[PDB]
Design an enzyme around this catalytic site. Structure first.
Site, mmCIF file in Angstrom:
data_model
loop_
_atom_site.group_PDB
_atom_site.id
_atom_site.type_symbol
_atom_site.label_atom_id
_atom_site.label_comp_id
_atom_site.label_asym_id
_atom_site.label_seq_id
_atom_site.Cartn_x
_atom_site.Cartn_y
_atom_site.Cartn_z
ATOM 1 N N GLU A 141 40.917 27.189 -56.764
ATOM 2 C CA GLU A 141 40.504 25.795 -56.735
ATOM 3 C C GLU A 141 41.481 24.870 -57.448
ATOM 4 O O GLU A 141 41.839 23.818 -56.921
ATOM 5 C CB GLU A 141 39.122 25.621 -57.378
ATOM 6 C CG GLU A 141 37.948 26.146 -56.559
ATOM 7 C CD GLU A 141 37.726 25.395 -55.256
ATOM 8 O OE1 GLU A 141 38.322 24.316 -55.050
ATOM 9 O OE2 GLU A 141 36.933 25.890 -54.431
ATOM 10 N N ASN A 199 39.176 13.345 -51.182
ATOM 11 C CA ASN A 199 38.856 13.711 -49.809
ATOM 12 C C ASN A 199 38.744 12.414 -49.016
ATOM 13 O O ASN A 199 37.688 11.777 -48.995
ATOM 14 C CB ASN A 199 37.534 14.488 -49.762
ATOM 15 C CG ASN A 199 37.583 15.774 -50.570
ATOM 16 O OD1 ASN A 199 38.318 16.704 -50.233
ATOM 17 N ND2 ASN A 199 36.806 15.828 -51.647
ATOM 18 N N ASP A 248 35.662 11.759 -46.415
ATOM 19 C CA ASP A 248 34.314 11.329 -46.783
ATOM 20 C C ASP A 248 34.196 10.490 -48.056
ATOM 21 O O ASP A 248 33.091 10.229 -48.528
ATOM 22 C CB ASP A 248 33.363 12.534 -46.847
ATOM 23 C CG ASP A 248 33.823 13.604 -47.823
ATOM 24 O OD1 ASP A 248 34.438 13.270 -48.857
ATOM 25 O OD2 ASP A 248 33.551 14.792 -47.552
ATOM 26 N N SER A 264 34.869 11.237 -51.151
ATOM 27 C CA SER A 264 34.482 11.942 -52.370
ATOM 28 C C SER A 264 35.721 12.537 -53.026
ATOM 29 O O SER A 264 36.777 12.653 -52.399
ATOM 30 C CB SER A 264 33.474 13.053 -52.060
ATOM 31 O OG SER A 264 34.088 14.113 -51.349
ATOM 32 N N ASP A 299 37.139 15.769 -55.781
ATOM 33 C CA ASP A 299 36.865 17.037 -56.460
ATOM 34 C C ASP A 299 37.539 16.956 -57.824
ATOM 35 O O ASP A 299 38.714 16.606 -57.919
ATOM 36 C CB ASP A 299 37.419 18.210 -55.654
ATOM 37 C CG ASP A 299 36.758 18.349 -54.296
ATOM 38 O OD1 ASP A 299 35.518 18.221 -54.222
ATOM 39 O OD2 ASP A 299 37.477 18.590 -53.306
ATOM 40 N N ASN A 309 32.621 18.516 -56.790
ATOM 41 C CA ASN A 309 32.536 17.310 -55.961
ATOM 42 C C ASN A 309 31.664 16.163 -56.481
ATOM 43 O O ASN A 309 30.548 16.375 -56.955
ATOM 44 C CB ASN A 309 32.100 17.703 -54.547
ATOM 45 C CG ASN A 309 32.333 16.605 -53.530
ATOM 46 O OD1 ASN A 309 31.414 15.873 -53.174
ATOM 47 N ND2 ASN A 309 33.567 16.490 -53.051
#
Length: 130
Positions: A35, A46, A49, A51, A53, A60
């Site tokens: 990750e 992202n 959408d 959002s 991380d 998220n």
């Protein structure tokens, strides 16, 4: 902060991650590796959408932490996403524990399915004294 493999392994064990909700320490290590590369400052936007991380576990902003700019935010961890960018991973661990309390468990992270599931993950904790 970019953690050294065994340093992180010992830190996660002290924080009670080994066997939490049936998830072995090696699985948590495999997750962190893919990750963020063990980097607490990692952030990924992202564009699809809106959002983002955050942190070592790439948690998220739509469901777990609040950053104020993500539409439909739930903030299940009751934490500012800023808390997930600290060198001290206590808050990130508390939130990660919350994520796996949901039905999906560690499968909540797609990277775990792609890089960790059904694989020999012993290499992530080998020789760390955990």
């Amino acid at each position: 902060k970019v953690f050294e493999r065994c340093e992180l392994a010992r830190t996660l064990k002290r924080l009670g991650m080994d066997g939490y909700r049936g998830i072995s320490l090696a699985n948590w290590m495999c997750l962190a590796k893919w990750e963020s590369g063990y980097n607490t400052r990692a952030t990924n936007y992202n564009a699809g959408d809106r959002s983002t991380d955050y942190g070592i576990f790439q948690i998220n902003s739509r469901y777990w932490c609040n950053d104020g700019k993500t539409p439909g935010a739930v903030n299940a961890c009751h934490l500012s996403c800023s808390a997930l960018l600290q060198d001290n991973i206590a808050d990130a661990v508390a939130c990660a524990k919350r994520v796996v309390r949901d039905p999906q468990g560690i499968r909540a992270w797609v990277a775990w399915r792609n890089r960790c599931q059904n694989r020999d993950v012993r290499q992530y904790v080998q020789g760390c004294g955990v």
